[PDB]
Design a binder for this molecule. Structure first.
Ligand code: HM4
Ligand code: CA
Ligand code: CO
Ligand code: CO
Ligand code: CO
Length: 304
C-alpha cells in the first residue's frame, strides 16, 4: 500500500476493550462480524422515522451524554497524548454514563471512537501515535443508551497550528452551522449540500462525497442519507420529528478519498488535510433542536 501523506498507522493495537454486561448493548455488539440486523432490515428504504415523545426524550438524553463524552476527549487533546489514550478515556466515560460506545464492534470497528488526524477524513482508528504539535484532530463520538444512539464530532487543534489549519477548521464549522440554520419542516434534505459546498468552495476547499450525514435514533445509521455536496439526489423532505446528522468533511485539496488496508481509515488521495464537525439534529415544528449542542459554553472547543 502506498500512503497518501505522512501519517502511518502505529501498531500494535490494544486488545478490544470490554464493556460491562450491565450496560445495554446494541444488536451488532455481539454479532461475529459486527453486523446490525435491525439496520440491515431497512437497508435501501428511504422512509424516515417520525419520533414519538418517548423517542425524543431518549434522544435528548443520549445526545447530552455524548456531548459530555466529547468534552472529556477535548480536555485530553495536547501534544504527546496518543489517540489510543483518548479512546481509553472515551470508553471509560461512556461506561461511567451507563452507555455503550456505539463504534465498538460496529462492523468489527476495533475501538470506541474515531480519531482522525490531518489527512484522515474520517474513521481513523485510535492507535499508538502521539499527537504532534501542529496537528488537527477530529474525535467522533457516538453513545448508545436505552435503545438510542447519539452522535457528534469536533476537530481540535493540537498546540499551535498554521493559518491554513485555522481556516480549514473554521470554514468546516461554519459549513455545518449554515446547514443547521437552514433546517426546518418543509426543506428538502438535498438542499443542505448546496449550502455546505457553496461556503466551502468560496474558501477554496472541497467537499468529501463518499461519506454523508445520516438518520440516527434506534439505529446508528439509517434514512435519510444526507450528502454534503451540491446537486445531490438525496430523497426526502424534513418534518417535525425527524432526527438526523449533518457532518461535513471538508478538504484543503481535492475531495477524493481512499481507504487504508485496515478497511476503515479514510484519507484524502492527495494527502492534504481534512476537517469535520457534526451534530445530531431534531426537526421541530418550526426549526431544529441541536441535541448535541454545548449547554454551558457558547462556542466549539477550537474557538474556546
Ligand atoms: C453501510 C452501513 C453499515 C449502514 O454503515 C454506514 O453507513 N456507516 C457510516 C455512514 C456515514 C458515516 N459513518 C458511517 C460509519 O459507519 N461510521 C462509523 N463510525 C464508527 C464506527 S463506524
Ligand atoms: Ca482530519
Ligand atoms: Co462514521
Ligand atoms: Co459521528
Ligand atoms: Co454521524
Amino acid at each position: 500500500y502506498r500512503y497518501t501523506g505522512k501519517l502511518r498507522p502505529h501498531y500494535p493495537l490494544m486488545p478490544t476493550r470490554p464493556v460491562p454486561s450491565y450496560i445495554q448493548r446494541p444488536d451488532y455488539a455481539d454479532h461475529p462480524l459486527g453486523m446490525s440486523e435491525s439496520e440491515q432490515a431497512l437497508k435501501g428504504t428511504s422512509q424516515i422515522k417520525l419520533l414519538s415523545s418517548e423517542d425524543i426524550e431518549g434522544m435528548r438524553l443520549v445526545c447530552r451524554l455524548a456531548r459530555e463524552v466529547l468534552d472529556v476527549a477535548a480536555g485530553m487533546i495536547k501534544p504527546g497524548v496518543t489517540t489510543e489514550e483518548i479512546d481509553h478515556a472515551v470508553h471509560l466515560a461512556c461506561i461511567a454514563r451507563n452507555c455503550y460506545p456505539s463504534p465498538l464492534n460496529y462492523y468489527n470497528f476495533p475501538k470506541s471512537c474515531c480519531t482522525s488526524v490531518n489527512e484522515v477524513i474520517c474513521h481513523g482508528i485510535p492507535d499508538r501515535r502521539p499527537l504532534q504539535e501542529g496537528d488537527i484532530v477530529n474525535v467522533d463520538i457516538t453513545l448508545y443508551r436505552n435503545g438510542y444512539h447519539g452522535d457528534l464530532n469536533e476537530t481540535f487543534f493540537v498546540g499551535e497550528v498554521d493559518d491554513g489549519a485555522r481556516k480549514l477548521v473554521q470554514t468546516t464549522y461554519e459549513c455545518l452551522m449554515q446547514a443547521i440554520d437552514a433546517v426546518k419542516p418543509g426543506v428538502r434534505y438535498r438542499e443542505l449540500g448546496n449550502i455546505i459546498q457553496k461556503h466551502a468552495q468560496a474558501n477554496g476547499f472541497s467537499v468529501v462525497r463518499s461519506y454523508c450525514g445520516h438518520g440516527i435514533h434506534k439505529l446508528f445509521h439509517t434514512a435519510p442519507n444526507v450528502p454534503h455536496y451540491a446537486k445531490n439526489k438525496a430523497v426526502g423532505v424534513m418534518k417535525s420529528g425527524h432526527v438526523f446528522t449533518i457532518e461535513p468533511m471538508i478538504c484543503e485539496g481535492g475531495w477524493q478519498d481512499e481507504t487504508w488496508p485496515d478497511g476503515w481509515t479514510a484519507v484524502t488521495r492527495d494527502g492534504k488535510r481534512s476537517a469535520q464537525f457534526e451534530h445530531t439534529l431534531l426537526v421541530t415544528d418550526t426549526g431544529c433542536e441541536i441535541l448535541t449542542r454545548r449547554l454551558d459554553s457558547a462556542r466549539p472547543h477550537f474557538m474556546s
